[PDB]
Assembly symmetry: D2
Homo-oligomer: 220 residues x 4
């Protein structure tokens, strides 16, 4: 396999949120077969960001997912040619983000070219007031649609004053070559900011992701 | 400790509904094991048979008291008895068919009683609901979170279709206790709902659910 | 025509909002070809209602629409047999209402049998806190889909103390016989509560609705 | 006033739809007090576009709106400083587009700096199969929220075959200086492609927009 037990990551995100332009560079490494990874992210244009950094973090690669052998791994199969994915993120106060990420590979390093856009966030809402603490861990539902793989996940930001702020993710993952498509399944995630400075100019970010079927037995 | 929710509980319910303008009534009787998160219902269409739409759109409306809760997650549902609770749900399908439901859940003795209203609007006539092209719901993971002193649960649901592929529905439920109960932290309920048996028109259906609550299985690094 | 210049209206709404059951009866009259009507509405079960009465009022009949001769009138064509319609009302704080109304006629009177449900309204939102003043006038977009007529409208409640609370309506209107189907067109509305008592047990309700094409010409190529 | 009876237009849009990157330049002119304008658009990168051009056209300036004297004109008031706007475009098959446009002025010319993104369009749907004929004329609902102006409009594309494909627009318009805010009102639109070459590399585009209150009298 061209996907090595350890893979490096280099990325560039260009984005606009609430009319504010920014650029973030990232580099890191992970263990694709263990489903873990760490990124160091640096804001290079647009500092200090005026919005909650958490809206960006799930856009900073399902190749980093532990797949059991009885679930087809759409993502690792797509390399070396790679894949791109598209996502809409619809927040409960009708802020909407979109993102597109093109994922390529050279040697033992993935490269991501990322676009991120955010519109219609209310000025006193938790994104523009930076009142989020973290995403909760989540379970993404993965299902084939029209020859590509979709993943939908109900996401929730824990808020500074207590309670949660909900966002619905709809992602489409698109291999650049023909691969075997998987059966319906789940990817459980936990994404965490491990360290940040005061304005989130420098952020260290970790994700754990593991695929599974339901382990509830079927009675029919 | 001793609970009014016994290891086995019976169920009696009545659903009154309208889908695509078609009125119907369904009666159900069954039993389950609330602490094991399992249950079986026998359902009979008593008015409006045969139904002209996919029976699967109804099945998650036929009680989170039937959920296996680990000791370290507050069980919102079992705490609320005997007084009970009601819940409200919207079910938004990807072709903009929309269903709503309200269910009032009470208890007498060893039996739960549900009084259910179900409505569905704007299902496309050639879509999988009105063409009865669904096979089952997939198993699911519902996200539970407190808001305004009550419990919300949201779940991304998918119907497997005849011929392949899935038809998606977004569920938003609010669960509302009739008495004060200890509120849980954010958590998950994994479900698998299954029709075990049905006659040709689904006038008689046997329905099973397994539901288990959990936190994430993944450790935290931070 | 079986639709006379003045028609009477009788209706019954049975509903549940936020778990609260209620029943409302209505009686009134209007002028179908002028697009105007008045209803007198009385809560007979569930009083006093604990939610904003405005969420109900557009559910209390597009036969009352002034249709120009060059737009097919889906609604008047379907009588005497009548029609039913189905609606979802998605509010911006994710309260959702559904309604189904079956509309029949006997003699000079329309009859509506209505079901109304509302779920997941936030307890401190403007519906459960009765902070609405009125619906703004609106423009509904009408289009045929799969042999029946859809109408979608962006609606807005003006709030006490200012600003608006938005709701997206999606309605399907279903004739009980074959009728000539219209081209894409618009229905402009203004619905108004003319009078109510303290708890809205007794409400007097008016609607004006007029169909049209766009007022803007198409540019020659 | 700095808004002359005829104003020129220059714009650049950079975008990504379905993972396809493109750039479009435009130039034109219009009559802001008549609510009319014409643009000639030229695809400079990413030609030919693989998706229906109609998804772009409403992103190619409410300063071109006929405002009666009794409705405050949010858009003309904000010049010369200008404004930016943000929009989400949610299609009924859950394709979603976002756009952000920054509108500035120099002399008798408007300048637009536009970003457009489109995600999750079905591969055999009418956008990616280029089955759209036009937008229908529309009525946008304009209402103040949190000190800025929102406009929401139910849009419909007429399709090859004669049915319609629906999209819901939510726009926030954001002045760069304090302006008199309008009461709730309507903007009626008709946008039309007047001429195009085979692949829509070159498009001539017209919009007519007119603000009004409801014509219907109030009985209360």
């Amino acid at each position: 396999s061209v996907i090595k037990p350890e893979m490096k990551i280099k990325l560039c995100m260009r984005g606009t949120v609430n009319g504010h332009n920014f650029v973030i560079e990232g580099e890191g490494k992970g263990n694709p077969y263990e489903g873990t990874q760490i990124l160091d992210l640096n804001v290079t244009e647009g500092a200090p960001l005026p919005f909650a950094y958490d809206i960006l973090t799930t856009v900073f690669n399902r190749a980093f997912t532990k797949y059991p052998a009885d679930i087809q791994d759409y993502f690792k199969q797509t390399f070396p040619e790679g894949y791109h994915w598209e996502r809409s993120m619809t927040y409960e106060d009708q802020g909407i983000c979109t993102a597109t990420s093109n994922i390529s590979m050279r040697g033992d390093c993935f490269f991501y070219d990322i676009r991120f856009d955010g519109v219609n966030f209310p000025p006193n809402g938790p994104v523009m007031q930076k009142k989020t603490l973290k995403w909760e861990p989540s379970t993404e539902k993965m299902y084939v649609r029209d020859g590509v793989l979709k993943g939908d996940v109900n996401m929730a930001l824990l808020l500074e004053g207590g309670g949660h702020y909900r966002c619905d993710f709809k992602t489409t993952y698109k291999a650049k070559k023909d691969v075997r498509l998987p059966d319906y399944h789940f990817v459980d995630h936990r994404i965490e900011i491990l360290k940040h400075d005061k304005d989130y100019n420098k952020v260290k970010l970790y994700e754990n992701a593991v695929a599974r079927y339901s382990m509830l037995p079927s009675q029919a």
